[PDB]
Amino acid sequence: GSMPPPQKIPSVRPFKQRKSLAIRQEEVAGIRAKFPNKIPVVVERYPRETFLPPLDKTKFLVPQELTMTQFLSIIRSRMVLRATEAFYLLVNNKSLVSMSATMAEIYRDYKDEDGFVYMTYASQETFG
């Protein structure tokens, strides 16, 4: 018969996370209420990127007064690989590294359906 191949077949629980749409709304609901000044961002590694390995943390609860540029510094610090290389932090896989943009603005603009802000990092887009 025609059995379709399932997409994305990893381990049962590769990460002790497993957040469903509902659970995402719940945690974000708790976070928003418990920490009004903090915003939960989720930083994922660029699927085409091979230079920069997965970071120590995937989820960052940072102050809304925090800027893209200072967050960039945090990301580079949270790298499991030592590198002072230049890299771009893209928001919603689209927005560029607006150094003057705060997490506050970013959240209100790029809030996802689950309430989190998803960011993607890579050394160089398209590499070059």
Q: Where are the domains of the chain?
A: 1-128
Look at phi and psi of residue 4 and say left if phi exceeds 0, alpha if psi is from -120 to 50, else beta.
Answer: beta
67/111 Cα distance (integer angstroms): 16
Q: Beta-carbon neighbour count of residue 59 at 10 Å?
A: 13
Q: Beta-carbon neighbour count of residue 74 at 10 Å?
A: 16
DSSP 8-class letter at 42: E
Answer CATH for 1-128 from 3.30.70.270, 3.30.9.10, 3.50.50.60, 3.10.20.90: 3.10.20.90
123/118 Cα distance (integer angstroms): 17
Longest distance between any two alpha carbons in the chain, whole Å: 56
The kind and range of the H/E element at 120 are strand 117-122
Contact 52, 78 (CB under 8 A): no
117 phi and psi, to 5 degrees?
Answer: -105, 115
Within 13 Å of residue 41, how many CA atoms lie on the same side as its CB?
Answer: 31
Cα of 95 vs its chain's centroid, Å: 12
Strands (DSSP E) found in 5-98: 38-45, 59-63, 88-91
62/41 Cα distance (integer angstroms): 7
Q: Which two tokens stand for residue 99?
A: 């150094």
22 phi and psi, to 5 degrees?
Answer: -60, -55
